[PDB]
Amino acid sequence: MNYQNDDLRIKEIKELLPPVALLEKFPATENAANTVAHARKAIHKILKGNDDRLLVVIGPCSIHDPVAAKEYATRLLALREELKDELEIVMRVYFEKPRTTVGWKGLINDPHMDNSFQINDGLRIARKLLLDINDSGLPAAGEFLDMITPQYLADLMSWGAIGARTTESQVHRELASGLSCPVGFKNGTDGTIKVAIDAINAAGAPHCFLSVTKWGHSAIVNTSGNGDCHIILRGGKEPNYSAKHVAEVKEGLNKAGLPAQVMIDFSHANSSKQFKKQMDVCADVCQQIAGGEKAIIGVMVESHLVEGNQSLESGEPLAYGKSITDACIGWEDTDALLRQLANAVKARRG
Amino acid sequence: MNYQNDDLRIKEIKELLPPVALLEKFPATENAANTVAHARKAIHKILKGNDDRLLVVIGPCSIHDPVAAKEYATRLLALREELKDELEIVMRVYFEKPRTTVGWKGLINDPHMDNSFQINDGLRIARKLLLDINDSGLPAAGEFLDMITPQYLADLMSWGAIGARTTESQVHRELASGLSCPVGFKNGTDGTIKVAIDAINAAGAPHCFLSVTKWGHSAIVNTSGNGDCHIILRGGKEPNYSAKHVAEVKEGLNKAGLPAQVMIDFSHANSSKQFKKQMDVCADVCQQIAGGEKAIIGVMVESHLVEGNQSLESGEPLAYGKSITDACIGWEDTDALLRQLANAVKARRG
Amino acid sequence: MNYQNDDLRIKEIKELLPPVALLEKFPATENAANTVAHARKAIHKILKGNDDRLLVVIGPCSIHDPVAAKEYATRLLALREELKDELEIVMRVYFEKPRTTVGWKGLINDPHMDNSFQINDGLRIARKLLLDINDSGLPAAGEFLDMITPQYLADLMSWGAIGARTTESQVHRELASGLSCPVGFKNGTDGTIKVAIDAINAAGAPHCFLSVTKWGHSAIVNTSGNGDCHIILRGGKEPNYSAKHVAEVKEGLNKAGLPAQVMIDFSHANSSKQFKKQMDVCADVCQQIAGGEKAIIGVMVESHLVEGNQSLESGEPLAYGKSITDACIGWEDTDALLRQLANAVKARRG
Amino acid sequence: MNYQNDDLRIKEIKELLPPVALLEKFPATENAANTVAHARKAIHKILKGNDDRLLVVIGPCSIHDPVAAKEYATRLLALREELKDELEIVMRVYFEKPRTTVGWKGLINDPHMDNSFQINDGLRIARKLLLDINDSGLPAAGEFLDMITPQYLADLMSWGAIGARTTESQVHRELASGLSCPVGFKNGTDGTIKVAIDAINAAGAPHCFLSVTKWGHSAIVNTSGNGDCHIILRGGKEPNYSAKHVAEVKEGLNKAGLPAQVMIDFSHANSSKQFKKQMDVCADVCQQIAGGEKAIIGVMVESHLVEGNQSLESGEPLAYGKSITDACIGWEDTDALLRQLANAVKARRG
Numbered sequence A, B, C, D: 001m002n003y004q005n006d007d008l009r010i011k012e013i014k015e016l017l018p019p020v021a022l023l024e025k026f027p028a029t030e031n032a033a034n035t036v037a038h039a040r041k042a043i044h045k046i047l048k049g050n051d052d053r054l055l056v057v058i059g060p061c062s063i064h065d066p067v068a069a070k071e072y073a074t075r076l077l078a079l080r081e082e083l084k085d086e087l088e089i090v091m092r093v094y095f096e097k098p099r100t101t102v103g104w105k106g107l108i109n110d111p112h113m114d115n116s117f118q119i120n121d122g123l124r125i126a127r128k129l130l131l132d133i134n135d136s137g138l139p140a141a142g143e144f145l146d147m148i149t150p151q152y153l154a155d156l157m158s159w160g161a162i163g164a165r166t167t168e169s170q171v172h173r174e175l176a177s178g179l180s181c182p183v184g185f186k187n188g189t190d191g192t193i194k195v196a197i198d199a200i201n202a203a204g205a206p207h208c209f210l211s212v213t214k215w216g217h218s219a220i221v222n223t224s225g226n227g228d229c230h231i232i233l234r235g236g237k238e239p240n241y242s243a244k245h246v247a248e249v250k251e252g253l254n255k256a257g258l259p260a261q262v263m264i265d266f267s268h269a270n271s272s273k274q275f276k277k278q279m280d281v282c283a284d285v286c287q288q289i290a291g292g293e294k295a296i297i298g299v300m301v302e303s304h305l306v307e308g309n310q311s312l313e314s315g316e317p318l319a320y321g322k323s324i325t326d327a328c329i330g331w332e333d334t335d336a337l338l339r340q341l342a343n344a345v346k347a348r349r350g
């Protein structure tokens, strides 16, 4: 069908597997379904206060290899068990990082990292990976950049995050008010806290947004509202993790009529884009936690099997278990890190 | 179909008329299609620096009544023909205003302003309105809050705008890189200029984003980049229209390899939310324009048949031709203001 | 998507405008909707036994030109009004004739009679034609060859027929049990009556059949049973119209527990494929009717503006208002034949 | 969406999993794909006249239990391997038997035999069954009652049949002209042979028919013609298997330009609805074959693990391996009847 003045800047547009196809091929096993249900209920209590543990969303910056991802998941699953009594460990399974610039479009948009853009392969690979991880008993945390992807993966998400650059977007807020899991809004790029707070209030109400039915047709979604949303401090022009800021944030939250709780992102802006510094932020935060700090309900750490990152866009033989986006701490620091956190929660415990 | 851990916060979700249904029922008449082709070409020239005229996106804050909206159009169309050598008048046909708070969800989401949420009626009403306006010879400018609505109306848009709360959203940038019309990114809420500049650069590159085919099915869209994007100064905590700022902005664009050009929004934050102050901003801006400021390729004015706004909640029978969202200057000030700008453009010519 | 051992004999398969698109573009006008509502009730009243009037499905064998079709309609409409007291005239608007062999695939499958197979144009042309006809006051009768087409046109059909070659088809029976209009089953090709009788029974029950939603998705339809079905005698190896056969048929019907009512097809096998002989059948039948025969509720006549038939694959240009499938009596004989029936109906009455 | 005069006799209509969902969940394993490809090639050589082996479509009348069907399959696969130089054994996997009104609607329409009508469960169950059967090495033969089901299972069918009640239906002829597997048309109910002969010719040509894309959307299909179609003699008011009839048929075929070859159904009308008599028909037929009849390229036998049949309406636990539709010869007679047929084929060979 040819319409006038239509699709002028569209190189190409093609049907995507309908959600139902992905659900039918990779249905949630009984374990996977449990892992999800339980991890959601658990995060709900921590946010409701009825639990003194720390939510810990730790994992690779972005996932580009299911093999490494599942090995990583295996290790993280062990620690999840060990520190089970203090922490509620959840894997950060993110498939793409929003780039103002160019770069790899992620596991879903371009599974083969060769600009082939086999997105239907992406969905398959992505969903199977989440399915496997959840099946093994390890909950997963993911990000939601648009209003359509949720239909293919939300049911395997125990926790999700609306990034900094979209926290103020009405549509993303409306989306969050309909997600079946706890949502965490990041503070503005420059460090602005108001946006995230308003977001939290908006997510709590009922909304309408366009997306697609599980059969893939365009649809209007009417949400109920989501009360399990909290803020995520990822720094601005200067870190947000200091007790000085926590104090500030705790203020604004109550001022807005929302529980004074926050999650702290050791990476990104709080890490000054230096994966090494995540260990330092851990120091300051662990102290706050142990020194009787309750408002902090969770943290976020970018870690992989191998520290640092590597250039994919330079035509280099990628190394296994090493992030190809933001730099992540190695598995050594990750363990030490988690152990410290576990204790700071024990200290604080009283 | 019942899935585990699914749609826990979804009150309801229903099929939405596929785009093809709207296109088939309301196809572009030959006039409408010309109107759209021509006005897009015109704005392209102004943005390429080959037309000393001014792009003027003027019209109701939000449209809630096709009748008034069509009367308004008839009037604006007259001036459009009159001042056509100084200005390139384009009607602001917006259907909804993003709200944190509560409020009417707009003509599309709730055509009957009674929370009946007859969105399929919305699309028919909206698309038929744009169709009529364009058919009369008056181009229309709209805003795009999501990645799906475009499919139902973009072909009747001669110009579009990515609002302040979304200018930094990667998806909305990607979406802009695929629209068939010039796009205008607003500066951040607090006044931040960088976010709109980065946006402009990104929208010029080819991107991938999910949406739906004209047949209504979940699809992946590959754009080809949009070079007809510009910034829109709508003020921050303090107005942006002063030659002081304009000078800063022009510097930012040039430093980012972009043409020093800007559109100035007389309303919203530049008007301090006082519809009457739009007349004042007009003074200062007509000043710079007459003075020979060529970085100002266009302005935006919220105006209706009758000035001021009114409420829906009040229970009093809505007043004809009067905004139910942001306050707008009446038709009298409008005719006045347009004639000033007309002269200002002449001034900058001699 | 590439599947093994799949589509080996498919030259090509393409999406079809979803029904909703055709409904949105060509909604039934008031006059059209009523014309259908009244014609159905009226035919129902007849099958009920409370109307001595005769249902007369008369019209071109197949329609290939909207212009001649609407002229024909205009004329038939006049008579429809004139003989309103004795006959319930309904136009036969058939788009295709099932051919073992080759030949034109009909107005819908190939609107342009040039093998271009523009089916989406067919749907639009066909639907608009029925819409105009109805809007003028003339009900329409059509045939249903598959389970999908109904979704695009049934709402404009006041009466439908399941042809001889499909009367014994389970799917077509299930389909008829869900049509919103009276359905008429024809007796088998060789003259068999049992098949049509079983069909009338089966169609009276609720069934399940696959088709598509108004949105174009594959769906499961659950009908509620259709009690307005009757048999159509179209002859076998030798005509069926004689009182001898009528008598046997009425008996078979009662024997099967169904009302003893029949519709007689003057054309096809009862006419021995001799369009002229339709006038003779009219004589024998008008006789039974005038003689008190009440089981005859209706008749079917193939007639056009110009009698006879012409060949499409003959390459030769086409003569206006002349069938390109089965030969039809001209408009002169039509007006004559209709009036005869009118009188025969008066006879049976007064 | 509510339309005028629409869906008046529709109790309900719901989306059906799109084909792509079944294909994604149950993709053909390599073996299954081979089994299917090879058996189609084999049956092709037979019909082409380049193989003296006999095609044997034997199996339950209908399948209501995957577990027994798989046991049957295992037994039959063994004989398939043994008698492979004489017979090309293909399992009859039919899910439903057309009934005038009352009765179980089949494994697909009602998997749970409790009127729950879990058709999506049907497709999953049916497709998985065919998938496992083919994967084990046993080809499968099925029937196609509508134009939509093929999309979900045809890729697992090595041979298919158009039943007696639909052989004369144009849409089913068109559909056969597009199937990727050899098709068998059954003679009319009353024994008529012409209808199946015409069908074979029709299915040989290219046609158009509506159905749905693999994505589930209403679509128009353009076939390329099917040359691997043959007749199936299943008796009329009296059996068709006698050499007398086989002689008439062979003439009818040659008279129509078709190779004189037939498949003889030992069951149904040829068996006078007496499962025991299938053994008798086998006698007369093995006779003809052994006596040098090269026109008999195949036979069809209704057989299960246990002879006879049983009712659902009875209310007693169902017997394992026992038809709930037409009566079938049990397993012992099957091994018998096959071994006979094998020798006959061996006979005719020398």
Ligand SMILES: N[C@@H](Cc1ccccc1)C(=O)O
Pocket: A147, A148, A150, A151, A154, A155, A178, A179, A180, A181, A211, A212, A221, B005, B006, B007, B008, B009, B010, B013
């Ligand atoms: N299925 C999502 C909700 C959703 C519905 C529709 C569109 C987008 C998201 C969930 O369970 O979280």
Ligand SMILES: N[C@@H](Cc1ccccc1)C(=O)O
Pocket: A005, A006, A007, A008, A010, A013, B147, B148, B150, B151, B154, B155, B178, B179, B180, B181, B211, B212, B221
């Ligand atoms: N059709 C739109 C572009 C578009 C396609 C697909 C999704 C979103 C937008 C235009 O002409 O601008």
Ligand SMILES: N[C@@H](Cc1ccccc1)C(=O)O
Pocket: C147, C148, C150, C151, C154, C155, C178, C179, C180, C181, C211, C212, C221, D005, D006, D007, D008, D009, D010, D013
């Ligand atoms: N819409 C048809 C019925 C129908 C529904 C679905 C499939 C086929 C037919 C009618 O009103 O008569």
Ligand SMILES: N[C@@H](Cc1ccccc1)C(=O)O
Pocket: C005, C006, C007, C008, C009, C010, C013, D147, D148, D150, D151, D154, D155, D175, D178, D179, D180, D181, D211, D212, D221
């Ligand atoms: N896919 C089927 C053919 C088919 C396509 C579309 C509709 C119906 C049938 C086959 O391989 O035989």
Ligand SMILES: [Mn+2]
Pocket: A061, A062, A097, A268, A302, A325, A326
């Ligand atoms: Mn990162």
Ligand SMILES: [Mn+2]
Pocket: B061, B062, B097, B268, B302, B325, B326
């Ligand atoms: Mn406004």
Ligand SMILES: [Mn+2]
Pocket: C061, C062, C097, C302, C325, C326
């Ligand atoms: Mn005819």
Ligand SMILES: [Mn+2]
Pocket: D061, D062, D097, D268, D302, D325, D326
């Ligand atoms: Mn049977």
